[PDB]
């Protein structure tokens, strides 16, 4: 078939005394090595290199009387959302921040409440009359919700806050383009 003998012939430079010399015996070797890197990478490299990290964040937790058996269950209880490789980065470069975490999980602080579902506003039920001019009652509140969340994010000096300085006037930016 196709031995990939083109690619695997440049590699014969970095082999020992026999595979480097003779082209045949080098291929059976370099194609045996390359076929086991890809065999170890996709199969066994994870379960090993994934436990040298759960040993480093753990060993860095014993210096605070806790351990991975307890830390793992309470990094999640608090919704902290830290990859187990990140906790090893902190335990090794930012030792205080890690410790600061380890104090939180041990503290009796209420974890953040589970995210809420979709709540129907009251105004969805509130019977609308036959009025065409004014907007629906639910949009005048939902839109207000969107512009407050629009100004709370960041400290955008919207032209040093040249846009309407207050909200009830920002919802009237449609009258700015009327004559």
């Amino acid at each position: 078939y196709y031995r990939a003998t083109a690619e695997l012939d440049r590699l014969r430079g970095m082999l020992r005394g026999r595979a480097r010399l003779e082209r045949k015996v080098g291929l059976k070797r370099i194609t045996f090595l390359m076929r086991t890197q890809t065999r170890y990478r996709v199969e066994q490299k994870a379960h090993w290199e994934r436990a040298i990290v759960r040993k480093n964040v753990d060993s860095a937790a014993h210096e605070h009387g806790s351990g991975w058996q307890h830390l793992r269950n309470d990094l999640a209880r608090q919704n902290l959302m830290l990859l187990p490789r990140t906790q090893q980065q902190l335990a090794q470069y930012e030792p205080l921040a890690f410790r600061a975490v380890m104090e939180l999980c041990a503290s009796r602080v209420a974890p953040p409440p589970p995210p809420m579902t979709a709540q129907v506003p009251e105004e969805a039920y509130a019977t609308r009359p036959e009025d065409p001019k004014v907007a629906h009652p639910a949009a005048r509140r939902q839109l207000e919700e969107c512009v407050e969340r629009m100004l709370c994010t960041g400290r955008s000096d919207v032209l040093q806050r040249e846009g309407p300085r207050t909200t009830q006037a920002w919802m009237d930016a449609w009258k700015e383009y009327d004559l």
């Binding site: 040298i52 040993k55 480093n56 964040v57 060993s59 860095a60 014993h62 090893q88 335990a91 090794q92």
Partner: protein, 147 residues
């Protein structure tokens, strides 16, 4: 021995009073400290070890008759050379030979593959059968641990 992958530069000198503590367990904690696993910077290539001084060996404990019915068996090359020796039979010879054998069971567990990693962590434990030990000047800090 300087030999990069050694790291004698951040050493801490522990002290594990073996008095009354179980011999198959003092060999466990002392291994996490010689192999340097108690360190958050532990990478298996580096042998960042911390010297342990396991004084008071002769006061070790072995639950039940495990002083009489646990063999230190080793089979040499000569045919008919299989040797069986209890703990109460090697304790006649040298009490530290039973602790150094129970350490060898723990360091091997993670380092059997390469000779440089099999033996180097073993040279970090100083097995002293009583109080006296020449390491007063190394300030062996008594490591806290509860089995």
């Amino acid at each position: 021995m300087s030999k990069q992958w050694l790291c004698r530069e951040g050493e801490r000198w522990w002290l594990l009073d073996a008095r009354g503590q179980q011999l198959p367990h003092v060999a466990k904690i002392a291994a996490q400290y010689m192999t340097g696993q108690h360190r958050p910077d532990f990478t298996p290539g580096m042998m960042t070890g911390d010297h342990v001084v396991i004084t008071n060996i002769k006061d070790a404990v072995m639950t039940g008759d495990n002083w009489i019915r646990v063999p230190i068996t080793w089979q040499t090359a000569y045919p008919g050379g299989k040797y069986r020796v209890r703990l109460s039979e090697m304790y006649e010879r040298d009490p530290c030979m039973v602790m150094w054998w129970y350490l060898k069971d723990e360091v091997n567990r993670h380092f059997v593959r390469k000779l440089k990693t099999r033996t180097a962590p073993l040279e970090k434990a100083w097995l002293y059968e009583d109080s006296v030990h020449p390491h007063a000047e190394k300030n062996p800090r008594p490591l806290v641990w509860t089995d």
